[PDB]
Symmetry: C4
Subunit: 315 residues, 4 copies
Amino acid sequence: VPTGGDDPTKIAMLGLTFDDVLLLPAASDVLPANADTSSQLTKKIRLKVPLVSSAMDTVTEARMAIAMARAGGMGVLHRNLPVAEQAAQVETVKRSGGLLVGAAVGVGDDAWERAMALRDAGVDVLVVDTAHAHNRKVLDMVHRLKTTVGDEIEVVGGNVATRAAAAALVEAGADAVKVGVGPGSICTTRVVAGVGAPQITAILEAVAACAPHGVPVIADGGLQYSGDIAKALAAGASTAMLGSLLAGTAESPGELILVNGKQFKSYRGRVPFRGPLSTVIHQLVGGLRAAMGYTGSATIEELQQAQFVQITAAG
Amino acid sequence: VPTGGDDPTKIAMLGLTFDDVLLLPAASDVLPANADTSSQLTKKIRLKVPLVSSAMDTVTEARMAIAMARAGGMGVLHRNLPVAEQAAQVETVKRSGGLLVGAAVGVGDDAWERAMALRDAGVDVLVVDTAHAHNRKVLDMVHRLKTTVGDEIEVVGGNVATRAAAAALVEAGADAVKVGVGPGSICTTRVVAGVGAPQITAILEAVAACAPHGVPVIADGGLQYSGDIAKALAAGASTAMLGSLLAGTAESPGELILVNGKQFKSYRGRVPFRGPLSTVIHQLVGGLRAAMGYTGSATIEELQQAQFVQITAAG
Amino acid sequence: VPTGGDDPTKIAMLGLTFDDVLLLPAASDVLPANADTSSQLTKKIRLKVPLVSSAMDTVTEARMAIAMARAGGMGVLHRNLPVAEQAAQVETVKRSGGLLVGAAVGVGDDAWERAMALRDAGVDVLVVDTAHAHNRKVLDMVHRLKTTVGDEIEVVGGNVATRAAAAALVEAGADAVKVGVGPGSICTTRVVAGVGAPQITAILEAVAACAPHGVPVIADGGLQYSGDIAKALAAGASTAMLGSLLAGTAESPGELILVNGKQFKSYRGRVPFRGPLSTVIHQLVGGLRAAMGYTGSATIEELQQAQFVQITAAG
Amino acid sequence: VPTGGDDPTKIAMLGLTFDDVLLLPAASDVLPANADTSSQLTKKIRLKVPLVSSAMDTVTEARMAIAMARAGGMGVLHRNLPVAEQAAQVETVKRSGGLLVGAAVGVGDDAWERAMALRDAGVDVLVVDTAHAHNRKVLDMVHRLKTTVGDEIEVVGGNVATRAAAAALVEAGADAVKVGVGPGSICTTRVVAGVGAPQITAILEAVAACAPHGVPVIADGGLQYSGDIAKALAAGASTAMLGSLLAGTAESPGELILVNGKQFKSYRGRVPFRGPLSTVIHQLVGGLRAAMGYTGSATIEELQQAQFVQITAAG
């Protein structure tokens, strides 16, 4: 093997991240303003805008979830709080109109009780929210939820970064699979544990397992620019989950931070303050619409068939 | 596939930009001072210097177009102004002697009326000037112009970044094809839309479609140094269109900007002030002539057959 | 050959360092808290934590060796001091309980006398400590020690960076092989001599020679983060030797250095002050445990079978 | 072709520079102090140290040439001065003992008269010193000199960066071939003309043409560290010519420059002041000797057979 040892499988793949690729323009009859940006969040739930906000306590509580749903996306309420309060946040969202909302649960001791409280409060999507879903405890939770509340509630499982892990969640009954393990995020799993998977490759692999079963993939982590959203969807994802890009909006939890005359909000680090969510979402969707124009993609399903060019460090 | 998924065509190519390659020296009987730098702008129009200025409101109005033509190149007047004023700028150029001039038009509602006014004013080249030419509306405009005023006026179409798009413009009747979509320019299409094509690869692909039909390619975007001009032509382009490299000249629109004791002009950002156009063109042509000496290229047509070496990030 | 000349073996391999790769998550039943981090330092000696401190006079004297052994690893006492004092440092460690300790020796004139003094003082591991072990003098020393004191003392040989060099040490009787020649360390062998071997490739190659003979490999040099420890072991090493990561701990030789309000210690350069060794080791083992969770590795032997993804400069 | 177009030869090679490679350690019986650093400058002339100073007016006049010869290398006197003065500099060197000296000549109108004056003054090596030697005028000059003064004087030709160009100089009768065209030097041929060849690949290619005819290659340009000298020789060069590395020595032309409390000398830019030449040469040869130890190279001829590992941007 050119890189060492005698085992060609030891280095299993060349992992590409968003910055490694660009979408190629293609024949187009699509104007950006006329593109259809709707996409499946889960097998049953379609969003008007293929964006959801991260289940993080610096990103999504009730205010963010309401704003996301109104913008045509969805929020996933974080679970770093008592069960009754998360459930109360769900109720708050639901009484602000007929708005979709999700909520995270883990696989710990209180996770089942949390899930039932969220169900009672009227949640639409339960996200089984773990660092590493390729694990019997996680798969069992997904399956148990699906078999218990699956008629009324869509169940998302994550996170994964390989084809085999995605396939396991599909088999367990997941309604969507969330992709992102060491995706290049603030937790720096890559530096601390040495573990990760560049996101374009991770999405391509997960989609290879999910699309043949009609299960949408949520790209979760490492998205820095509006152009990354287009790349994630073209790699085959159906939606993108955003943390850092939304943590600086007015609707996110936390107060303004002023450093050297500039405004920031906290992210757990800090991110530039961006103003209202509606403004950020408008910019992001603007970039996505531009990509759909350039690639001749009338719908997100067409964008999922677009081609890339791989670029070098110089590019 | 080593980079993910099961489709080898998903990542269609490895895209190289100017910084990825160098021209290889070759046997030479050519002194730089003796090289012939003339080249086809379009099927019919040959320039003494293979350079044209961008149709941008911070680069080319009448003053720039006159200076470019006198230097042996050509300017393309921007279209971000009323039809009558663009036409008046064409007349201004034409009465400063027998000087070649081009002008941009779009495909919008006023585009045809604009084109006819430019024709009436005596324009030599009409540039159908769009972000993405691989589109029926753009192709129809190129064809309609060619069939209406094509005896008297050369029609350029752009921009493209693929072989198929270039082939479409050739079929529509374009007299030259302009290449540059997300080429690494100020609009940052790459960041916003996630779309682009590294320019050396884009030129190689466009030339594969254009040269067999005798249609010149204009390299448009991403040229930062005189050496990039030589690389663009060696990749097969016949001329290079320059924005950032000319936006800092005296002849470009806009006033001097003084920041921290240094002089700049606006580019839409800012670029260092460079003095007279003649000085910049002299430097650029000097670099091109040096490249022709090193590669043994007596003419631009010979330079188009030169070879590259690909270099690494370390290089 | 694409890179020049007619000899495909002139450039023998593509060398990967830690930053070039990430561990891929895999199916897991392993919780980080439950992983077994024990590993072979030598054929006979197993450590509770697979970490040893460098035989450097800014890293390991008695205080560090005692702290390392108590933390479940081991220190290797440096040899930049008189024989009697190194031996006295060994005695000091041994009387602080039943603690494992190693000590470096060279191949110079006093090296044999040094080794016998260390043996007399009760050392557990002798490390034949050279810049380049692929040399008859070094191999002879390893063999002579092994044949003289090998029943009571384990003999480590190093350093190497190739399969052939590792094989030579195995043949000479080494109980462990230490890998790291121009690994990216403070001596900058790479810059001064132009010599080196990226560590992931060097470990893969050494392990190819050592594992079939049941000889552990010690990864020595270039480890900057806790994640690098996991990568080194997954490449096949059994332990990691740390210099820069430990030189900033309280237990290392040298005084505090205050520069611009920040605290440092000397490394021979300087490194940030990190506090007690126990704290650093806790963080490092925490990262290793996380990696074992993500990869489904119940033991270090299982981690040695994990797979990598190669990443780009963008990643 | 993956990088564009339909011609696989358009991008002819992947060019590696010094920073792209490292020397691999190998079995060694060689101590650095015992290595033989002597090497052929030309077919007939062997130097004790394989280093020559650049024919540049900020590097080599008489003082530098005398110091280089005394250190066991050689200086090449620059030609940016009247013929009589260059000849007078040759005489000055020759009367400082039995010291080897070279001198540059061009191919211009005064070049032949210059060469005969240098011959009369007792020069040992004439260097036909051009930017691009693959040219009939340059080849004719090399041949004419060789046929006229070749019994008494060795004739070096340069510069080249390809196998074909090197072969042409060999055929013309060159006693050594100098390699370096856009090697990454202060003239920035790469940026201005877009022309160049990464030096490791350029040396490998030139050596492929020169070694079978017993003609030494001089690596000229891009050497920044002592380790680069070892890499250049291992790629097959017999000597290295140094500009930037020597321009900061006391013996080089020009005065001390003080900027922000630091000392520099001019290079035509500026380089840090390094003190006496003897000191710099000592460091450089020290690095070379270390490389010979690591690679088991008893002689420069053995070092020329050493192997590389290619490293990534991360390395």
